[PDB]
């Protein structure tokens with residue numbers, strides 16, 4: 001039959017989700033029509049009505065983290081979770097398509113761009129003299145947003161597929177963290193946010209996000225965390241987390257979103273990246289392929305009727 | 308083996324190539340050191356010295372086109388050409404790494420961004436009233452640059468691997484046409500530019516580019532073509548082609564670069580994409596795998612030893 | 615035919631443990647990323663991340 005409903009970010013990018021007008025244009029001449037939350041914690045979340053009762057294969061793709069600073073190393077990719085689920089007719093599936101975390105370089109500011117190309121070495125100078133980054137903060141990418149697929153019960157959302165996002169690459173990240181994936185399948189494990197420090201941590205499933213630069217949880221709007229407070233008032237390092245619980249960027253990398261948010265560097269280490277998020281698959285489904293880092297840029301959701 | 312030489316855009320993006328300083332930082336702590344043309348038609352072209360006579364595997368990757376307007380549909384990916392060649396010691400390989408064509412949205416102009424988010428509907432208004440786009444031009448992405456790998460003979464450059472770039476996505480392109488690839492291997496066929504129209508066409512191997520918004524040919528510097536003239540004087544739609552012969556963007560999509568440049572819409576059709584470029588492989592080499600559209604973003608070059 | 619020849623170049627001489635024999639087959643042949651040629655850049659990264667997973671180690 002090859003009936004495939006493909007969900008994207010509707011052209012939106014950054015710490016905020018898409019609008020209804022953006023998604024109305026993005027799905028033109030397609031077989032797909034969704035509702036977008038206009039305000040509140042559902043802002044930017046797409047709502048799709050399941051057309052028929054059948055066995056569906058939901059392919060979730062997370063979003064990648066932000067690029068590094070002068071090094072411009074390979075960004076931490078998002079996670080892919082592919083599952084098989086049974087759905088009923090007229091079930092209302094809520095889909096949040098994770099957006100990429102904002103990159104550090106390149107940038108539109110003239111003073112910033114000289115730092116990206118390696119001509120302005122004030123950041124490297126302060127590290128060599130005083131052993132750490134305390135004054136000229138910034139240069140790392142923001143945390144990537146996670147892709148959430150859930151359906152509302154009577155009053156409480158229940159997750160089905162969560163494709164964790166990748167952590168932000170640090171400014172002076174000579175290493176790539178070489179990190180394995182994580183996948184949880186017990187709903188009794190609560191998905192709190194990541195360990196936010198100088199850089200913002202990742203947003204989880206259900207938490208109480210306090211820090212502005214930390215990624216908001218799914219039930220709090222999943223807004224991308226703001227830039228580092230110390231990276232402001234000295235630069236214009238607007239390196240924010242991606243829509244979907246992405247953490248804000250600093251000299252260190254921001255944490256990526258997911259079920260359990262990724263951790264962040266506690267002391268603004270310029271060589272320490274933010275950690276990737278934790279993926280989740282509901283016990284109601286069957287894991288087709290284990291979680292794997294595959295996605296560069298924005299995430300997606302694909303339904304294909306497997307068995 | 309550590310014979311893994313990887314070539315990138317050195318962090319450069321847009322219609323111009325990288326500088327010598329940019330590539331010196333991009334290849335830091337690597338086994339690679341190249342020369343970059345400082346001025347003239349060789350500006351932005353990387354020059355690599357072959358270290359030993361052996362059988363090499365040259366993996367060429369083109370660059371993808373620009374994103375659409377309000378739809379922000381899937382960009383046309385770049386082309387991959389993988390070949391096997393015999394090289395001699397001290398041969399001077401010239402490498403031009405194709406850069407991605409500029410996207411339409413987001414933009415830095417205050418008035419433009421209101422069109423990207425769907426609040427300003429002047430473009431949709433003129434289409435409904437006067438059936439076509441004649442005044443408020445712009446909104447399509449620029450053509451992607453191609454990756455050129457060639458070595459100079461006595462006085463004339465001779466191409467070895469040309470990985471064509473992807474065409475720019477049009478503003479209102481609700482469809483992706485799924486167009487097939489093209490690959491030429493007969494040097495008697497001359498690689499002229501594409502049929503430039505309202506939007507700029509792709510730059511070829513050897514042509515005489517006149518229009519500003521058309522992509523320059525390889526022997527002319529392969530500079531990305533400028534934005535649409537009509538998209539100026541009314542907007543700030545600086546949607547230019549990628550470095551490597553990418554065509555400029557308009558209401559329609561720009562043509563991608565390559566051996567033979569991609570064609571462009573002749574009447575500024577807002578729903579008609581620009582066409583992808585034509586790839587080329589030298590008859591002296593062996594094609595490992597046929598050309599496939601795989602590359603998203605900037606292109607690459609990979610040289611290894613497996614044989 | 616050719617998917618097998620192309621993707622090996624991207625991933626190199628990758629090894630898979632017996633515990634991932636059916637995991638490899640499902641990913642290589644049945645996943646959307648490894649069936650659309652436009653997403654072969656995705657499939658190459660999928661297989662590489664598979665080899666470093668705790669299941670496919672040793």
Ligand SMILES: *[C@@H]1O[C@H](CO)[C@@H](O)[C@H](O)[C@H]1NC(C)=O
Pocket residue numbers: 122125126129130135
């Ligand atoms: C390093 O030295 C002191 C801190 O001990 C500080 O005042 C100075 O500005 C620092 N240098 C740079 C280049 O930031």
Ligand SMILES: *[C@@H]1O[C@H](CO)[C@@H](O)[C@H](O)[C@H]1NC(C)=O
Pocket residue numbers: 432433434436437
């Ligand atoms: C449509 O009519 C004419 C085209 O001949 C043009 O001057 C006018 O501005 C157009 N109207 C809009 C709303 O674009």
